[PDB]
């Protein structure tokens, strides 16, 4: 096994209090002899799944809870099992952010929400509305200042605006069926941001460091950022305030609220040490203070210490923005949702795509897994049992239905022509239970990847899946059909997502075979 036993490697993002954390790590090493290394690798949310999947990575990973459902579902997180007493030390709603399929998959640490940060010397009264910001920037430009700079390379920062007039990721009733990414609310918000850019009030290349530097150098009146940012502002001597985000179309900006959480790698041979470190050293008044004093955490999950931080008006403002926002879902396709929306915002802002085009593709990217699983699960189950599924597809499921119709039609031929091939291939393998279905995945990934990417080969891969699902039914392993469909779907979207989106997803499929 890759991960070193007898020490702890922790990953946390480089904008958080890593030095403070490492100090908590020193304390732990002092009492236990166990060294703690805190690293803040770049793109660590991307890297964790890649490396943890191969039995590697940090013992503990810090990120907002939104990425942990992906990780938990891929088996990359140890289930955590803190006792009732410990559980009572943290806010139930923070524990809620770390519950995935009924299990606690991470330790909650802090609730984070973007707030509007402003320079009180430049801007005594922060704009209440986004709509006033263009006029406000006119004024400020007259003095060689700008109104607002915030990170346009990460959709997190734009999201409160996109979500203000009705955009949403997955409707909470999480109907993963209902994606709000390209609705009129999203369009209106992202259109507003794009007009800010076209009218020179924002620059589309502005990233974290540039917005930060401009706010911290007094060049811009406002930014949008989280509590982690306040330390650098303190050091810069800007007289800043932290306040409610502006409204858009009379409605609050709805930031996606994150619970900074700490997950223990399923591959870690140091789970007990990680539980000890997180429960008894980090999630303590002193532990969270050390981290917070370095870069503020937000509203911490630990009740005792949050009662002290709650008096800080910057935290009250963070909580104000959090209550107007929504807790991020932790469902596995959050990763894809964010990747899609990131690209949409970058492209809309740079003019590479219109808002319409960009959010359409983002809707497609966001829906891709679920849409593909719906198609593939259905096809696989109707092929194995001979009977179609009676349940409707959703309100956005004309595509599913047409793609399934296409798949039936094209897939019939492909299975029929490949029956002898598939029987031989199927015979090679022992495919008798759910334990073999994960093996399949590798075989199928490897074979699928080996050749050119086109819809005909996608049909072949799904058709072999259909073949196997039939085999699984015949041997009373119908319960393995869904896992096979999930596995095929994962293979397909993880390795072909960009291609899939370029083809307009399953609409492209229908079109290619029309
Ligand atoms: C793991 C079984 C899978 S998954 C899959 N996905 C896409 N395409 C596939 O095969 C098509 C025919 C191709 O090679 O282009 C396959 C095959 C497959 C099946 C039976 C076979 N006999 C010889 C090769 C072969 C390959
Ligand atoms: O921008 C997409 C990104 O949004 C959130 O990431 C935040 C994170 O929650 C904060 O703690 C801080 O690190 O800034 C990030 C934005 O760059 C999501 O948590 C993340 O999964 C997502 O990709």
Swiss-Prot record:
Pfam families: SBP_bac_1. CDD domains: PBP2_MBP. Coiled coil: none annotated. The keyword Transport applies. Keywords: Periplasm, Signal, Sugar transport, Transport. GO terms for molecular function: carbohydrate transmembrane transporter activity; maltose binding. One of its GO terms (biological process) is maltodextrin transmembrane transport. It is found in: Periplasm. PANTHER family: MALTOSE-BINDING PERIPLASMIC PROTEIN, MALTOSE_MALTODEXTRIN-BINDING PERIPLASMIC PROTEIN. NCBIfam families: PRK09474.1. Belongs to the bacterial solute-binding protein 1 family. Part of the ABC transporter complex MalEFGK involved in maltose/maltodextrin import. Binds maltose and higher maltodextrins. This is Maltose/maltodextrin-binding periplasmic protein.
């Amino acid at each position: 096994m890759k991960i070193e036993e007898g020490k702890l490697v922790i990953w946390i993002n480089g904008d958080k209090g890593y030095n403070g954390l490492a100090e908590v790590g020193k304390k732990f090493e002092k009492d236990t002899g166990i060294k703690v290394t805190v690293e803040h690798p770049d793109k660590l949310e991307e890297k964790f799944p890649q490396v943890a999947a191969t039995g590697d990575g940090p013992d503990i990973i810090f990120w907002a809870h939104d990425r942990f459902g992906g990780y938990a579902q891929s088996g990359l997180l140890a289930e955590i099992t803190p006792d009732k007493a410990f559980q009572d030390k943290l806010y139930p709603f923070t524990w809620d952010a770390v519950r995935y399929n009924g299990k606690l998959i991470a330790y909650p640490i802090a609730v984070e929400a973007l707030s509007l940060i402003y320079n009180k010397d430049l801007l005594p009264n922060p704009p209440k509305t986004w709509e006033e910001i263009p006029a406000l920037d006119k004024e400020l430009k007259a003095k060689g200042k700008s109104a607002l700079m915030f990170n346009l390379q990460e959709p997190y920062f734009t999201w409160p605006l996109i979500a203000a007039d009705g955009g949403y990721a997955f409707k909470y009733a999480y109907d993963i069926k209902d994606v709000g990414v390209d609705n009129a609310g999203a369009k209106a918000g992202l259109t507003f941001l794009v007009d800010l850019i076209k009218n020179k009030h924002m620059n589309a290349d502005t990233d974290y460091s540039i917005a930060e530097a401009a706010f911290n150098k007094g060049e811009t009146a406002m930014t949008i950022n989280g509590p982690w940012a306040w330390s650098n502002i303190d050091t810069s001597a800007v007289n800043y305030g932290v306040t409610v985000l502006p409204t858009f179309k009379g409605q609050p900006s709805k930031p996606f609220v994150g619970v900074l959480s700490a997950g223990i790698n399923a591959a870690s041979p140091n789970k007990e040490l990680a539980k000890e470190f997180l429960e008894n050293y980090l999630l303590t008044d002193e532990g969270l203070e050390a981290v917070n004093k370095d870069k503020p955490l937000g509203a911490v999950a630990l009740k005792s210490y949050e009662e002290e931080l709650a008096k800080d008006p910057r935290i009250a403002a963070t909580m104000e923005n959090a209550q107007k926002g929504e807790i991020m879902p932790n469902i596995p396709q959050m990763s894809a949702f964010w990747y899609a929306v990131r690209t949409a915002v970058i492209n809309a802002a740079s003019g590479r795509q219109t808002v319409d085009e960009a959010l359409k593709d983002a809707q497609t990217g966001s829906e891709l897994y679920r849409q593909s699983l719906e198609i593939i699960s259905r096809y696989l189950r109707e092929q194995a049992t001979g009977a179609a599924d009676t349940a409707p597809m959703g309100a956005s499921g004309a595509t599913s239905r047409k793609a399934l119709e296409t798949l039936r039609r094209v897939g019939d031929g492909v299975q029929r022509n490949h029956e002898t091939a598939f029987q031989g291939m199927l015979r090679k393998l022992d495919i008798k239970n759910e334990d073999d279905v994960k093996s399949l995945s590798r075989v199928m990934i490897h074979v699928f990847s080996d050749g050119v990417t086109n819809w005909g080969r996608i049909v072949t891969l799904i058709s072999f899946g259909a073949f196997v699902a039939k085999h699984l039914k015949t041997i009373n392993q119908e319960s393995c059909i869904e896992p096979l469909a999930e596995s095929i779907t994962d293979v397909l979207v993880r390795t072909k997502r960009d291609w899939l989106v370029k083809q307009r997803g399953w609409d492209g499929f229908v079109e290619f075979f029309h």
